[PDB]
């Protein structure tokens, strides 16, 4: 658990970039964006 | 060559390239009225010059994270690689830590890095690598090796974060190479003996009297005004005076003649300047030019010796005393000397 | 211990409390079935 979690915030990409960066601000929108993108087929395969 | 012992007094400078310029900006601390630590422009001092006095730390101990550990569970030495040390401030004697609060907002993650009064926790320590594969750890530091910073509280890199206005060193995880560059190396320091970067004034052999401006009951435009006087001013503050030399390392060393040195008021913070259309006045740090701000100390009134001296990396000859050492001050572009006046005419000599 | 406080403080720091609240709040519906591949 402690060398993982050190790799993980010393390689901080590994994070999603919605809910790690300076863009995205978390979880809650990432979960939310998400969602309207699983009920829009429009950003899918079709 | 020169090994980092403790003891000693550095100065924490990085390199930042943004918009396609370079820059050397150092660390910087207010220490007194706030806490949070800020950046200072070591490069650019042609015309404004840095705030050296608050741009230096000094290590206190260098010990291994196993003794680290078991001191908070619980000596000229040599600074190693993957060591901790303890940086105190030189000027508000507070320790450099890393804080809990956020500021900039661009880092949801990232933490700030301040002073602190007590050295417990594992906040006010920092362990040092190196930036490069030739040294490993272990290894003794020297002058100019890139270090990197770490954390031992939040285990994050000493950042240069990156803003608008916000250009405010963090504690993230992207590391940033620090250069330490030695101002006093705790050596013997010759008691009696004029040091760079002192804070110090001048008095006359027999007449008793001190180089001072004006009081705050006059406006600051007569404050720019300059003088001497006598009297209670011997002990004041507006009588001081700071010799701010031009170099950023080992400006602590011992000052010898002929060098180049700004003259600071420390009570008005700006500089002794000249134009020449005029006499000598005091002028703000934004405007600062070192050829008009530039003076030295001569030992006599010739002109046998201007440009002999050029550059000591070291602490230096003790040479100029503070008691038995008779210096002339002389412009470094005009070269004049000291004269006193007798500005107030016979209706008020027995006045001001 | 010390070390797992500070690995705690870590995760606390990286993932705040009140976004966590907030995912876990979002009340999906219950429904002829449906398609499961969603939240």
Redesign the interface.
């Given at each position: 658990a402690n060398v993982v979690v050190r790799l993980l915030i010393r390689r901080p990409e590994c994070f999603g970039p919605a809910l790690r960066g300076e863009g995205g601000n978390g979880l809650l929108a990432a979960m939310e964006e998400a969602i309207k993108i699983a009920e829009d087929p429009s950003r899918d395969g079709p | 060559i020169q090994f980092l012992r403790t003891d000693d007094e550095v100065v924490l400078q990085c390199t930042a390239t943004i918009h396609k310029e370079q820059q050397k900006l150092c660390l910087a601390a207010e220490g007194f009225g706030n806490r949070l630590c800020f950046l200072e422009s070591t490069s650019n001092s042609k015309n404004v010059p840095p705030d050296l006095s608050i741009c230096t730390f000094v290590l206190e101990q260098s010990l291994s994270v196993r003794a680290l550990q078991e001191m908070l569970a619980n000596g000229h030495r040599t600074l190693l690689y993957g060591h901790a040390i303890l940086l105190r401030h030189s000027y508000s004697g507070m320790y450099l830590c890393c804080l809990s609060t956020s500021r900039s907002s661009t880092d949801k993650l990232a933490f700030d890095v301040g002073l602190q009064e007590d050295t417990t926790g594992e906040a006010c320590w920092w362990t040092i690598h190196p930036a490069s594969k030739q040294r490993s750890e272990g290894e003794k530091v020297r002058v100019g090796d890139d270090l990197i910073l770490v954390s031992v509280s939040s285990e994050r890199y000493l950042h240069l974060s990156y803003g608008n206005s916000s250009w405010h060193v963090d504690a993230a995880f992207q590391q940033t190479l620090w250069s330490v560059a030695p101002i006093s190396s705790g050596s013997e320091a010759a008691q009696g003996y004029l040091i760079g970067g002192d804070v110090l004034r001048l008095l006359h052999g027999h007449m008793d009297e001190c180089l001072t401006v004006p009081s705050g009951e006059h406006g600051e435009e007569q404050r720019r005004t300059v003088h001497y006087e006598g009297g209670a001013v011997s002990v004041h503050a507006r009588s001081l005076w700071r010799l701010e030399t031009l170099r950023v390392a080992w400006s602590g060393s011992h000052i010898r003649w002929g060098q180049p040195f700004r003259l600071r008021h420390v009570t008005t913070g700006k500089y002794l300047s000249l134009m020449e259309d005029k006499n000598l006045l005091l002028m703000d740090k934004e405007k600062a030019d070192v050829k008009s701000t530039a003076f030295a100390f001569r030992s006599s009134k010739e002109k046998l010796d201007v440009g002999v001296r050029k550059e000591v990396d070291g602490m230096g000859t003790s040479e100029i005393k503070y008691g038995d050492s008779i210096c002339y001050i002389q412009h470094v572009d005009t070269g004049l000397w000291l004269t006193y006046q007798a500005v107030d005419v016979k209706s008020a000599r027995m006045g001001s | 211990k010390?070390?797992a406080i500070?690995?705690r403080?870590?995760?606390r720091?990286?993932?705040?409390l009140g976004?966590?609240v907030?995912?876990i709040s979002?009340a999906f519906q219950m429904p002829e079935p449906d398609m499961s591949?969603?939240?």
């Open positions: - | - | 010390g070390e500070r690995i403080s870590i995760l720091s990286l993932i705040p976004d966590l907030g995912v979002i591949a969603g939240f």
